[PDB]
Amino acid sequence: PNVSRTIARELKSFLLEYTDETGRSVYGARIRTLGEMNSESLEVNYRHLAESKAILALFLAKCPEEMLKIFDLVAMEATELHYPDYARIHSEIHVRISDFPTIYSLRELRESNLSSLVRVTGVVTRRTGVFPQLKYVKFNCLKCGSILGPFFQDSNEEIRISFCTNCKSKGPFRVNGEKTVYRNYQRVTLQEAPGTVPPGRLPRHREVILLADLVDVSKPGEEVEVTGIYKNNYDGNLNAKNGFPVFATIIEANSIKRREVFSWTEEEEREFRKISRDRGIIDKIISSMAPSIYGHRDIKTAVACSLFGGVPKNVNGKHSIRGDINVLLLGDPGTAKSQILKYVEKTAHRAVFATGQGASAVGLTASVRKDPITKEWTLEGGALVLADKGVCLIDEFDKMNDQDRTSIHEAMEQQSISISKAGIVTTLQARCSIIAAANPNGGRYNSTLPLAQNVSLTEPILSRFDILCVVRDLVDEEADERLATFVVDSHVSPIPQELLMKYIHYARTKIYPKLHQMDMDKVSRVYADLRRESISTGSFPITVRHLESILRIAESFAKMRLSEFVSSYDLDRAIKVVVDSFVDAQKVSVRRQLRRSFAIY
Amino acid sequence: QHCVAEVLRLDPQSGYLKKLTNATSILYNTSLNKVMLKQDEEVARCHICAYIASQKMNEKHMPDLCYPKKAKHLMNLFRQSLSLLVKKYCKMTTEEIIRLCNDFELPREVAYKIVDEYNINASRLVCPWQLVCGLVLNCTFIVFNERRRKDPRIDHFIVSKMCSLMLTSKVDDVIECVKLVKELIIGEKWFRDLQIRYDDFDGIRYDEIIFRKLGSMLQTTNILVTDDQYNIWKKRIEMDLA
Amino acid sequence: ERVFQISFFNLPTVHRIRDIRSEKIGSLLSISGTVTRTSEVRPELYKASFTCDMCRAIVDNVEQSFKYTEPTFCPNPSCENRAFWTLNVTRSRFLDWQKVRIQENANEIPTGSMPRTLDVILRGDSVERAKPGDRCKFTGVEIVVPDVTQLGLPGVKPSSTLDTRGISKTRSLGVRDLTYKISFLACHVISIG
Amino acid sequence: DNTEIIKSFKNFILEFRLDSQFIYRDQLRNNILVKNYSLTVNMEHLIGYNEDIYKKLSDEPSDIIPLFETAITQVAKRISILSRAQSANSLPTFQLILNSNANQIPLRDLDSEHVSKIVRLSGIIISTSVLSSRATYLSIMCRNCRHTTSITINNFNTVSLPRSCNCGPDPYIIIHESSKFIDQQFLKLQEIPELVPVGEMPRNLTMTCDRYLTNKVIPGTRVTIVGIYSIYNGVAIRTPYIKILGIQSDVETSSIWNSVTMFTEEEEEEFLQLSRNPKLYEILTNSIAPSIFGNEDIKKAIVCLLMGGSKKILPDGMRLRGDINVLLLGDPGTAKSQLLKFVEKVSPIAVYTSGKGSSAAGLTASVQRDPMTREFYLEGGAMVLADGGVVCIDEFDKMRDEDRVAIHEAMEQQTISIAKAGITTVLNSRT
Ligand SMILES: Nc1ncnc2c1ncn2[C@@H]1O[C@H](COP(=O)(O)OP(=O)(O)O)[C@@H](O)[C@H]1O
Ligand SMILES: Nc1ncnc2c1ncn2[C@@H]1O[C@H](COP(=O)(O)OP(=O)(O)O)[C@@H](O)[C@H]1O
Ligand SMILES: [Zn+2]
Ligand SMILES: [Zn+2]
Ligand SMILES: [Zn+2]
């Protein structure tokens, strides 16, 4: 229809003198921000102009791929009027829509709805490529050493020319890829939400195309709402169609979202410092660490020391000291063991939830792995590798073979991996914090034997663990009175974890608290005292490993408090943690150590 | 919008431009709206649209708007849906000699002046190639004096190009084609304007030739060379160690 | 603005897949079986326009079941070659489509036997009444479709070829091989069991 | 124009100086002696000297580069003739090599914009495929006309053979004995695994190089490179890649057994001063472990170990192990691990491993086959990567029998042998 004159003038009048509340020309802000940010897109809420007039939407529905025409050029006109030379820089502008009420599933699509506005739901998976494709074409002719003029490209065909400006010759033509201009084209898979598939039925799938410089705005495992158009695909080679002559379908999406980038602001570090320097945040940190279970505080504190990490240093590039902290839990499966580690995955930064065989993200190692797309060799690494600065979780540590154990051994030993396979030799940075778990032999821990004797683990990687916490059956009545009540209530002071993770993000970057050698020979005094007192009544000794680990814990608590340097009355906390970690890790013979080593309390 | 303006402002190669762009936009919109006008390569979908846009608004100029097989087809479909001197007594047109003058990339005012000369004095002719060739050669010599002066090689190259374009091996005839037209066109006011503009006056400046011919010895015959020449030449041997 | 569907249900007789022969072609016949798969809804070619390759003359007719390739008649017959044509997408009508895979039922199987299966196709608004992993009672007609999977098999193979006797002086033989399977169609289905 | 640019560029060659000394002039003079026909260039040096080339080379690099090539050729011709007149026919174009440190941009942040411009980035290397060749100057004869011609290609290692010099189409045969060619290779790249999303696999990209920019890199060597986002061949789509125009690599990543053997002269004086000092042994014993206590007896052995010993070859082939073998034995603490951790830092070319072989690290020759053509190639080994070097081990207790046999034989002859189905090997350990 040639109603384009009235349509254009009326939609431009809408764009210009739109007013909804307080005479608010909302789109002026949109356009001026577009000009400021050199943006290639602008959005228009469907609801308000639909309310004003609906035959706009009627003519859009009849042919929206044609309705786009007046809108893009009107956007260009508005952009030029307020931003001269924007036409010189940005060749063309695309548009976006929002607030469309019609709802279609991924299986509800019917022929009566195609070639009209379509709004779907699903999850983006199997993202592939940000490939370029043409939008302006010029050529390199052979019969004449000249070129072609600019030419916009349609949405559904290639281009090929047989004439020439000099003459009517169909000379060989080639595109000048070295001078043309391109845009963004993507192929994206889209699948229905498994959380609402009705009983018995299966979830269908589709395919999606993403354009308008909006590529790489999605990641697998996200709920999306793409609103756009719908049509078929005449991709040639269609004369070999057996059965009935039926064609596929593909969507062209305009609007994209991710609902259904953490950073610190000035007031946010102001409050961080305000609370850090005020009266021992540590008690509240342990209170708000993980409310998943009421549980117990000792391993919460151990893992709290694990979170923040310490401070690495070297004596002039030699004799390195590990800054990050390690942990290792163990106990009967009857209690919570695989809960708080997943909570830590959810709460921390650049954390990973890997596992052994079965229901695992990666095999905890690095290998020359294939890719489904065009056979792409890649060097993936275990969850340890991804968290070279961060932490890496594990559960069911016992369930490993030789090589997947030697890998974690190498990690905790030299903070570096090595590969000597497939014509490639390399090392990486494996300075990750480790968390793990395991299952004691027989369920119960067998209180009447030492650790290595009880569990069949090996010592060389067992040594690295500054903390080896353990619990057993808690048989008292109060255990029931608390745990059963809490669990049943699950179906009947602490600070937000968002603020906690933003705090750790703020802490790992700025503060590197020092420690002055003021009264620090007490370290040597107490170390020698307890190193003799170990032989006095026990079998196994205590080594300078624990000394260095207590120093790491001291600096970790310095970071935790966010104080300028070490505080004397927190070395007490660190020493007590290591002491009472060693207490439970021995035979009943250690019962004398209970009374003897309490002076350093 | 970029390509639309590119093609619309290709017509030269007040309200006209604005009304024409609006007409082209809405005409293309109407042609693409229905499913009745398909199999149409955009490669050339902004030519007769522009023709009918010119036809519509107020005024229409037949020439240089269609400037082919499918042109008429689309028009109907849309309008229903809605040597070189021995040759004797040769003929010429505007664009033939415009091309011959435009192979040098000379401006359009000079070409228009030559065309006016032709259409005024092409009645008693024997061979228009001679007059047009002389005209364009004496335009080149007058406008390109600077680069010819700084590079005496041009003289031979230009003469070879205009000897090969007219398919001849002898050149004294070209020399005649230059001097005769110089004799004929020697006293016209527009020629005067061109002379004062491009300051050839036989290839030498006015302020020098007056003293050259008046009978003085202060006339600057530049057997010597300018100071800046020496200043810029010194650099060549400054780096002679390499 | 008018497209129709029909169905016939509550037939008296039931035929298993093994109880179907070559004398029930194009004949209404009730079957019952099982489902093991579904397929993708893809709008099918009910009607579709074309255009002359030398003008805008549109034809809004369609050759629907098979032989979906070429119409002939042109409104302005003045054409050097009126044999072939062009196509169009918008001046057309479409209707839903769906494919499933039907399967034998356990309570009616013979000895030394696999659940012999075959493919059945749906149409129209009756779609969405299929279901994986269930027994159903189909009803329709014995549609058949081309295939080549049956090559390399014994016996002689039929082959089509246009005649060249009676008219003369006019692979040049244009020989097309024909060998067909026996699929099925469904006007109406119900969930049995 | 183009000649104003070519002159503004050629002035940069001979009329540029810093630290009161010519740099590129004498660099070219030395290169011509080396017979290199190339150079090195820093684009930071060009911003201050002249701004008439930076803002236009940024956006039209392919358009401006060949001009610089020809300018370099002209300078080369002048200096060649002048040098021949000074002391004591075929001078092809010189490749231009440059680098930069302005910034780095990751593959993730790329887009379909700034295509054909110049960009900077980082990554890791994988592929060393093949020395695929291209043509630069090849001669032609027509089969019927016997009409000789010639063709030369410049940078795109655009036009095809002539379609007509009756002879018909395709009238040309290609000579080889009088042609010329260069080498190139298809190189890959992929982002740093530590800076990636938690879930998805990484993405790689392909590149190409030319005569003297080849063979510079071996996989694993982290490199930063700068190139042009060029294109060649859904509905209508062309593949993206990058063309190399400048490569910088770490001086020496993971130890290369082909290391430096010609030291400078300025160090020799202090080397000999330390040699002639009578306190050498005490200095070494004091400094081999500055942050460590006691065990002077133990530390007094590492100095003997590192310097190897008496290599002695007899006319029977029974060589004596030039080096020595050591074994700590101790309880936790006592620095039994810290010394081993440190020793790699000091050692020039040596490897460190745990017991049983580390993650994807065969303690000895773990040979397998080729991903392409399924052929036999020796893969590697912790006992041969460090050929002519020391090896550090921990947790010597938990060995596999097969793993221990080979290392146990190395500890006495230092020559492993593998004689599996098809491959027969004598690969020297010497460690
Ligand atoms: N104190 C508790 N409060 C709530 N749930 C608990 C508690 N202790 C155990 N559970 C439940 O019991 C399960 C114990 O599993 P777990 O022993 O961690 O398995 P695995 O040993 O294989 O990791 C957890 O998934 C958790 O939901
Ligand atoms: N003899 C020593 N001198 C100085 N520091 C030591 C010594 N022994 C151990 N340490 C310290 O104790 C920690 C453990 O070192 P080491 O004994 O080498 O490993 P392990 O304790 O596993 O045997 C290291 O951080 C190291 O700094
Ligand atoms: Zn041509
Ligand atoms: Zn016709
Ligand atoms: Zn020939």
From Swiss-Prot, chain A:
GO terms for molecular function: ATP binding; ATP hydrolysis activity; chromatin binding; DNA replication origin binding; helicase activity; zinc ion binding. This is DNA replication licensing factor MCM2. Residues 281-488 form the MCM domain. Present with 1690 molecules/cell in log phase SD medium. Acts as a component of the MCM2-7 complex (MCM complex) which is the putative replicative helicase essential for 'once per cell cycle' DNA replication initiation and elongation in eukaryotic cells. The active ATPase sites in the MCM2-7 ring are formed through the interaction surfaces of two neighboring subunits such that a critical structure of a conserved arginine finger motif is provided in trans relative to the ATP-binding site of the Walker A box of the adjacent subunit. It comes from Saccharomyces cerevisiae (strain ATCC 204508 / S288c) (Baker's yeast). A zinc finger (C4-type) spans 141-167. The keyword DNA-binding applies. Its EC number is 3.6.4.12. GO terms for cellular component: CMG complex; cytoplasm; DNA replication preinitiation complex; MCM complex; nuclear pre-replicative complex; nuclear replication fork; nucleoplasm; nucleus. It catalyses: ATP + H2O = ADP + phosphate + H(+). A motif (Arginine finger) lies at residues 463-466. Its main location: nucleus. Keywords: ATP-binding, Cell cycle, DNA replication, DNA-binding, Helicase, Hydrolase, Metal-binding, Nucleotide-binding, Nucleus, Phosphoprotein, Zinc, Zinc-finger. The gene is MCM2.
Curated annotation (Swiss-Prot), chain B:
It is found in: Nucleus. It comes from the Eukaryota. GO terms for biological process: DNA replication initiation; pre-replicative complex assembly involved in nuclear cell cycle DNA replication; silent mating-type cassette heterochromatin formation. The keyword RNA-binding does not apply. Keywords: DNA replication, DNA-binding, Nucleus, Phosphoprotein. One of its GO terms (molecular function) is DNA replication origin binding. Belongs to the ORC6 family. Present with 2970 molecules/cell in log phase SD medium. This is Origin recognition complex subunit 6.
From Swiss-Prot, chain C:
This is DNA replication licensing factor MCM6. It comes from Saccharomyces cerevisiae (strain ATCC 204508 / S288c). It is found in: Nucleus. The modification Phosphoserine is found at residue 113. Acts as a component of the MCM2-7 complex (MCM complex) which is the putative replicative helicase essential for 'once per cell cycle' DNA replication initiation and elongation in eukaryotic cells. The active ATPase sites in the MCM2-7 ring are formed through the interaction surfaces of two neighboring subunits such that a critical structure of a conserved arginine finger motif is provided in trans relative to the ATP-binding site of the Walker A box of the adjacent subunit. The six ATPase active sites, however, are likely to contribute differentially to the complex helicase activity. Component of the MCM2-7 complex. The complex forms a toroidal hexameric ring with the proposed subunit order MCM2-MCM6-MCM4-MCM7-MCM3-MCM5; loaded onto DNA, forms a head-head double hexamer. Interacts with MCM10. Belongs to the MCM family.
From Swiss-Prot, chain D:
Residues 280-431 form the MCM domain. ATP binds at residues 330-337. The keyword Cell membrane does not apply. GO terms for cellular component: chromosome, telomeric region; CMG complex; cytoplasm; DNA replication preinitiation complex; MCM complex; nuclear pre-replicative complex; nuclear replication fork; nucleoplasm. It comes from Saccharomyces cerevisiae (strain ATCC 204508 / S288c). Its EC number is 3.6.4.12. The keyword Magnesium does not apply. Component of the MCM2-7 complex. The complex forms a toroidal hexameric ring with the proposed subunit order MCM2-MCM6-MCM4-MCM7-MCM3-MCM5; loaded onto DNA, forms a head-head double hexamer. Interacts with CSM1. This is Minichromosome maintenance protein 5. It is found in: Nucleus. Present with 10300 molecules/cell in log phase SD medium. Early fractionation of eukaryotic MCM proteins yielded a variety of dimeric, trimeric and tetrameric complexes with unclear biological significance. The MCM2-7 hexamer is the proposed physiological active complex. Belongs to the MCM family. One of its GO terms (biological process) is regulation of DNA-templated DNA replication initiation. One of its GO terms (molecular function) is chromatin binding. Its main location: nucleus. It catalyses: ATP + H2O = ADP + phosphate + H(+). The chain holds residues 23 to 517 of 775 of the full protein. Changing residue 336 to A: Loss of MCM2-7 complex helicase activity. It is an enzyme of class 3 (hydrolase). Keywords: ATP-binding, Cell cycle, DNA replication, DNA-binding, Helicase, Hydrolase, Nucleotide-binding, Nucleus.
